[PDB]
């Protein structure tokens, strides 16, 4: 469909809109095609695999193709990053991060049934089920 750019496919239901909001992908000025029930198409923008990895917590089974000159010049997939910044909120109500001009930041640790997310500031560790719930 699109000329040069990037595509994100096989996003679970009720996650494509989340990816658009949480990663501010519609804060560009060139074309974007989106289909829900989800898939997202952008033209002419870099996506480091750091940024594709940031989709792992939300759309783990998904793919990203770097497209140039109408051609598939790559097909990368997300795998768990070491750090997740900006998008998560620390569930510790006494954490300094809440009232202050800083970016949230969590260390990522895979577990048996869980992802362990450790806040950079309060140094408390939480389940990813707890962090993504509020």
């Amino acid at each position: 469909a699109i000329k040069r750019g990037t595509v994100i496919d096989h996003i679970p239901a009720q996650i494509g809109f989340k990816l658009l909001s949480l990663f501010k992908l519609t804060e560009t000025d060139q074309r974007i095609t989106i289909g829900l029930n989800d898939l997202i198409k952008i033209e002419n923008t870099f996506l480091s695999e750091d940024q594709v990895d940031q989709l792992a917590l939300y759309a783990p089974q998904a793919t990203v193709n770097r497209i140039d000159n109408y051609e598939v010049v790559g097909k990368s997939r997300p795998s768990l990053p070491e750090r997740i910044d900006n998008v998560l909120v620390c569930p510790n109500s006494n954490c300094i991060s809440h009232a202050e001009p800083v970016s949230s930041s969590f260390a990522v640790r895979k577990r048996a049934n869980d992802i362990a997310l450790k806040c950079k500031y309060c140094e408390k560790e939480f389940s990813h089920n707890v962090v993504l719930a509020n």
Partner: protein, 300 residues
Amino acid sequence: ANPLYQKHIISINDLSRDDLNLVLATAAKLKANPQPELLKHKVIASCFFEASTRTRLSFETSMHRLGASVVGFSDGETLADTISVISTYVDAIVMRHPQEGAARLATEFSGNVPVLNAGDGSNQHPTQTLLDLFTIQETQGRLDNLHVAMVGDLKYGRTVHSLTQALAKFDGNRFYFIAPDALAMPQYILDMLDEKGIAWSLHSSIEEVMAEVDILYMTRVQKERLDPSEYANVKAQFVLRASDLHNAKANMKVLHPLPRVDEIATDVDKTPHAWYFQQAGNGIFARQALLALVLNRDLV
């Protein structure tokens, strides 16, 4: 004279099964047919040594609904001397106090004047249990052979301790305890249920037992009791949303002694299961029944 005439109401543990049914029957009769002059010419002291606006408004409304006059205060001299003086003024003393046993001590200095315990520290709060029992009986039609789940801070919730002991005076009840390990139901309660052959079980989430529950009793989980971060990692186990009630029995009621913070989401309020505000309204009739039985010889 009725069995509770001029009696002190200090502890649920002092109330026999006949006492419980007497209070509940009187509460139902006063609800069906109010008696706004039953206690005319009575003066009742509303003594809130420890302030509690929500408790006081309920108690004082009960007094006025029966026609009694009310004097009182919210917030040195010994408690014994204070009661020695006030008991020369009034016909009954309703008192809330920060120290455990304060209501019991008051009875030893009040003479003929009855004392009604509105809460003595972490000990007893009998009218909260009585309004809970009255609400369960009203919505379920009975107090026996019920499935009762109790959620939240079971370790420090003296409200569930009292309700459990009161419900244990009726037959065939089955209990579900859903609490974090750090706030579990105390062992002395579990021992009491074992001595009576009463069935109980622990569950880590409400969805395990939702299908069987007749009463879902939610409690305050104050953030004081744990770390602020310890809270967040366990709090999902003990918060209720409307979507959690998809397989609930038609007759189930959600109860909560109030105030709620966020253990019950506001989208529960509009379901037919939400009954915590109706529960609070029932405190008027349970407290009316207590004042009527204690201050009036003949039954309602």
